[PDB]
Amino acid sequence: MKFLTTNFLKCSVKACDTSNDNFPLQYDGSKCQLVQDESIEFNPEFLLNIVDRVDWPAVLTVAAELGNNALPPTKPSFPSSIQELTDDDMAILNDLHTLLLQTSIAEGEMKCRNCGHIYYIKNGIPNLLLPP
Amino acid sequence: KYTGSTRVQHIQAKMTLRALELLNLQPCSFILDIGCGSGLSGEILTQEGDHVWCGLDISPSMLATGLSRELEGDLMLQDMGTGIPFRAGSFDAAISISAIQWLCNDPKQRLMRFFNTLYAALKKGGKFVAQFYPKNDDQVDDILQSAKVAGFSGGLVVDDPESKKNKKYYLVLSS
Ligand SMILES: [Zn+2]
Numbered sequence: 001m002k003f004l005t006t007n008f009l010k011c012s013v014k015a016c017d018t019s020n021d022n023f024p025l026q027y028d029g030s031k032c033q034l035v036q037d038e039s040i041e042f043n044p045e046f047l048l049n050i051v052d053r054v055d056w057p058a059v060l061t062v063a064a065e066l067g068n069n070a071l072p073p074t075k076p077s078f079p080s081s082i083q084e085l086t087d088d089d090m091a092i093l094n095d096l097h098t099l100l101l102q103t104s105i106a107e108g109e110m111k112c113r114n115c116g117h118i119y120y121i122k123n124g125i126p127n128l129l130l131p132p
Numbered sequence: 133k134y135t136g137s138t139r140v141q142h143i144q145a146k147m148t149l150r151a152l153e154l155l156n157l158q159p160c161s162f163i164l165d166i167g168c169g170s171g172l173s174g175e176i177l178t179q180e181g182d183h184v185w186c187g188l189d190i191s192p193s194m195l196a197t198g199l200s201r202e203l204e205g206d207l208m209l210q211d212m213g214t215g216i217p218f219r220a221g222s223f224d225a226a227i228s229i230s231a232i233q234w235l236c237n238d239p240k241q242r243l244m245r246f247f248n249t250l251y252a253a254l255k256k257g258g259k260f261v262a263q264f265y266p267k268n269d270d271q272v273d274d275i276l277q278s279a280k281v282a283g284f285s286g287g288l289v290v291d292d293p294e295s296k297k298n299k300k301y302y303l304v305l306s307s
Pocket of ligand 1: 011012013016022112113114115116117
């Protein structure tokens, strides 16, 4: 499960729908084994398309839980078009690519901060099925 | 009884491409693939549109097969009838091939849970196209009615409707 996915996945429990604490999930730093996948090519158009939607505070929270606190406190902003990118823009977009797309949790677990339900990730795949 | 896996693959590829034509998306969008099975549709999302996607399926065996395909999207074990577990406005669009009729297997409650939470998970104006195999007209109307109550607009496309073999139904909706 890619780091990007952590920025959109919320608790599946219905009672949590309107809870501010249903997102982001709380990832266990002692259980989550990370993988870097260099096979997914740099896609700067996708990143420009997604950035406005990205919840930066949630990025910071999950990344810190996973042992990365070397992130800027403010969400990176960009021009509105590929051609307007600077080398500095490009480098940050590249860092975003690595962070969001190329970094994944292969095995681990995470819980809802509202209801405490714990979700498990195995072979990169989160189990989002809800028990009786 | 059964269909050759290559034949199922060819048909699903064609329906996925048709769904994408109906969706008419900008390249490099963020897409939810609902009932993704073994990820064949996700492969096409990646290749055709350079899209980034998350795939949901109830079946461990399908997802395990998905793992063997070197997919670029994220697979998730989940049940579409329980709702779409993503925050508001996450996706540009959603696509579903050969899966939603499962919602009809309480069905009316699961159908509404599906459409309400999908409406929420799409960006404003986000689109959803689903190919599905209805058992009868009432099933079609029930699904369409549920989408309507949830706030979706749009309607239905039926390709090759004169053909009992080749007829296909596509729900084409906008939030
Ligand atoms: Zn919860």
